Amino acid sequence: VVSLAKRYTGRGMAFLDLIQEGNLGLIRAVEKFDYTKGYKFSTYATWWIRQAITRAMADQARTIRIPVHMVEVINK
DNA sequence: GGTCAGAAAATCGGTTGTGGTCAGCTGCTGCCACCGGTTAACCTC
Numbered sequence A: 001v002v003s004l005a006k007r008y009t010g011r012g013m014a015f016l017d018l019i020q021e022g023n024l025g026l027i028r029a030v031e032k033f034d035y036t037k038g039y040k041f042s043t044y045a046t047w048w049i050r051q052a053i054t055r056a057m058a059d060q061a062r063t064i065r066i067p068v069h070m071v072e073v074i075n076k
Numbered sequence B: 001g002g003t004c005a006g007a008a009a010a011t012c013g014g015t016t017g018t019g020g021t022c023a024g025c026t027g028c029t030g031c032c033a034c035c036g037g038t039t040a041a042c043c044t045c
Helices: A002-008 A015-031 A041-059 A068-075
Strands: none
Touching: A002 A015, A002 A041, A015 A041, A041 A068
C-alpha cells in the first residue's frame, strides 16, 4: 500500500495522510475479501485503496469543501 | 310673549359586512445531488 500510495504526491496532502487512508482501504478490503475467489489480494485491494485515497483527496483537497460531482466536473 | 317640543345637525362609537387580499401551508411536480454498476480502454499472466 506504500508503493500504491506513492503515486499521489503533490496533490493537496503530504504522503502520510495518503498512507493512512491506504491503511483504511486495506481494512475495508480485508473485511470485503473472500478466500474462494482464488485472486491475488493486492490486485483485489488496489481498487479499494485508490478509491479511498481519491475520495479522501476530494474531501480534504481545499480550505472550503466542494462536493464530489463538482470536483469531477472541475477535473473534466 | 314665554315654552316645551321636534328636526336636524355633528360626533364618538359600534356594526356588519363583506370583500378581498395576502401569509402561509402543504401535497404534488419535477429537477438535482451521491452511489455505485457497468463498459469500453491499458499492461502482459
